[PDB]
Symmetry: D2
Subunit: 240 residues, 4 copies
């Protein structure tokens, strides 16, 4: 009964929270990102609550679309996964006129192109497997994909892309028993919010969101059966 | 520690399941609707898990806006509530041209005007009360408020109105420590599904939604603190 | 060949501008609102650009749902109309807790209930008339129906309800040759914006919108035949 | 006084229609795409209505991001443009599990990465230029960016990405006198719709949309000054 979950960006931040909660719920968590020693440290702290439950690391750089799509170096085959949380990502703030090409192109690759490739691999491997209860693909998006802001043009594009991907995959994959959703965080207390503050946004709830709140939404989704094609916004009201 | 939750339409269907789950979580639930025999029956089954937790019935016809706004006959004052779930509603299916005025006007009053008056009362009563964590106002909407369909003009209008109200209230009330959201069901196995069935719709997930799936989303929201101004859709991909 | 258009709130503001543009385009315009002498003054100024074109006035108080729904006092029967622009409206700013019941209830009736009744009457009268090109039903909404703000709960709910109504009517009436849309103004230089200012909002385009710009969107829609179920937002980027 | 307009994909289909309309309105039109002889044929057919109006061709493959971002081979400097319509695009229908990588990657690049690069070049060149009325950037998106469908995962992602870009840029660039919007076509009678049919979709208006209808929305937007951050949907109801 321990099912496998793949969580990109599980070495820190929201992805580590997500991985922690899924482990406490009995999932066997594969965490994937670049920083191998950090992934090892997280893996060693993920709880073990069920017989058979095993956690894994995958050193994967999402700049490398071919590696992502081919499950290069992955500890388990793509066919093993019942849950895929696409959480890794990069944010860059710049006027579009001054945004260095190597940077925004890299961000688009990590945030959109590599997730497409990973999703394709997982879907190919699991579409026709029999299941009692739905598999789950969950993308971590951002309030910025739905409400525009200055200086985040390509970032917003990348995540809006994910949202459109999600909607269409939900329609495609519902009849195969795969449910597909986004969780959309607001300003969360992670390294990604170094140099920004919740007060620069027009927020109904004026403060920081903890990583726990984002993982709570993921856990809600993974436990659900009738939710697909949607976003769950955990954003202190930003998109209101 | 037992907080008070008001659930309109708590005597059957989705409202019964929401009441059962809030009660399991420790809330003292007041259920409000017309049918006194059925309200007493549900009250008797609501879980008691915390010392001091007690449930209540309120015989209330939401076509009487003045009774609703003044908490006429209520067991507790509006000031007592930390959760209000506005669930009661009527649905009518008709070409607009043939929709009897008395019918659509009563549906608009139950589904939108009465919830505005209830919400006013609660907000006036609780806005300045000190709270450690936010109070919750949660409206039960429908997929039809976001994606149009034939023969549901006024039903859609009433629930889209609720949505609009929700988003403005979330902006207004966030600084007062009240979070406001909608949960949007799809075609769920209730008395309202005399008339319609999941096959009439093009659904990513075929089949009926059970009432507890809708209540799961309400439960998730009540336990959250960083979610406001949103819809949680539990619709089998209807709005995807 | 002068087609007939009905514009509620034609006596000043947006509705006057809409009436002026449709008259310059050759429509025979019926302007409806409470101020009969004001309506007569506007009708006397509406351009006459071809033979057969005639304008008309309707003294109509949208607080009276039955008068609206029966076309009481209308100069032409509902069957005469090819274009219906639902423009008249009231806005009220208040904290929900302090919003006087007679005021918000009247605003809900003028902005939502009366328009449903007018729309029913028109649809009943023209649904089965043969048409070479589509008839148009166009509601004037507001950016606040899509992006929440404080102090506008019931105003927002009324206009969001119009949006929901529009989307369902577009689905119901497209196969009958009636296209149904909204135009959504932002802060426009009318009597409604006395005491507010474009600067209170967080606008990409920081200044006033002239009533001409709203009318231009209505003109575009009335000449269109493949646009239905949509909002055309003319809001200086409010909803961006 | 002929303003310049850049139209990608101006050799056929919607882009040809847009170029024709802008040319009849007095714009000097640069049409850009791969097929040079086809471009020259269209340029020869573009109306000349005004002294000073000149049309131009640019051979540009949007699979080459560096070419696009550098204006390689362009007839005029990026600083010459008052209107940029990003219309070129590719659609591909496939189950995601079977969607060839070279195909979906090239689609993403032509639909999203290369328009980002072009936009960057235009914005850098014109941001600080003095203007009496706004410049316009217009992206051609699709109903599929907003309402999911099976077999169009990456296509939808690419266009939803453009929508997210658009909303961010509208916020960024509004204060610079640049308005930014999308036009969203439905099933339109072009080479992209060979194989697909309006009857495969659940349409309020069951028929083909002509290219003229899409161009009419573009024309409306180019003549507007208070519209930014929005989509104009010309989709026969698809998104309703
Ligand atoms: C939304 O919310 C999500 C979570 O944000 P957060 O605030 O928790 O951000 P965060 O603390 O910055 O964490 C980002 C995560 O993404 C991973 N990541 C970054 N670039 C990567 C690459 N090229 N290949 C693989 N993994 C990569 C990082 O791990 P490594 O640094 O170990 O790769 C890290 O685990 C993001 O997608 C954000 O945009
Ligand atoms: C969405 O989802 C929500 C839950 O729907 P569902 O499918 O569970 O509907 P349902 O099974 O038909 O239940 C409707 C609920 O609303 C209550 N109600 C109906 N008219 C009322 C009135 N005039 N005054 C007060 N209470 C009234 C009913 O109780 P009584 O019959 O006892 O009043 C019942 O508890 C609805 O709002 C729907 O539109
Ligand atoms: N933005 C939305 O934009 C639309 C136009 O706004 P605006 O800025 O042009 O507003 P405005 O200048 O305040 O004009 C409002 C119009 O609505 C009409 N109206 C108001 N209450 C009415 C009632 N009870 N019955 C009939 N007509 C009534 C008014 O005419 P009378 O005063 O002559 O009735 C006037 O023609 C509104 O619906 C607004 O909510
Ligand atoms: C939405 O609506 C828009 C217009 O669609 P439509 O139905 O008019 O499609 P269409 O008839 O297929 O025309 C597509 C246009 O895009 C241009 N194009 C395609 N691939 C391109 C490339 N790699 N580089 C430069 N230009 C390229 C094509 O011209 P060439 O074939 O001359 O490059 C053509 O002008 C598309 O963006 C669609 O996705």
């Amino acid at each position: 009964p321990s099912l496998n979950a793949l969580v990109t960006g599980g070495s820190r931040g929201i992805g580590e929270a997500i991985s922690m909660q899924l482990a406490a719920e009995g999932y066997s968590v594969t965490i994937a990102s670049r920083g191998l020693e950090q992934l090892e440290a997280v893996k060693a702290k993920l709880p073990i609550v069920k017989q058979g439950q095993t956690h894994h690391v995958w050193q994967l750089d999402l700049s490398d679309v071919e590696a992502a799509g081919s499950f290069k170096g992955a500890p388990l085959p793509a066919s093993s996964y019942d849950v895929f949380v696409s959480n890794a990502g990069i944010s860059q703030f710049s006027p579009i006129a001054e945004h260095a090409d190597a940077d925004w192109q890299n961000m688009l690759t990590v945030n959109l192109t590599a997730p497409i490739a990973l999703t394709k691999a997982v879907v190919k491997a699991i579409s026709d497997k029999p299941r009692q209860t739905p598999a789950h693909i969950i993308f971590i998006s951002t309030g910025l994909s739905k409400r525009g802001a200055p200086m985040v043009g390509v970032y917003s594009a990348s995540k809006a892309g994910i949202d459109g991907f999600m909607r269409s995959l939900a329609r495609e994959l519902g009849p195969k028993g795969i449910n597909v959703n986004c969780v959309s965080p607001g300003v969360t207390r992670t390294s990604m919010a170094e140099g920004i503050d919740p007060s620069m946004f027009d927020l109904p709830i004026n403060g920081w969101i903890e990583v726990d709140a984002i993982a709570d939404a993921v856990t809600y989704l993974v436990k659900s059966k009738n939710v697909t094609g949607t976003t769950v916004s955990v954003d202190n009201g930003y998109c209101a």
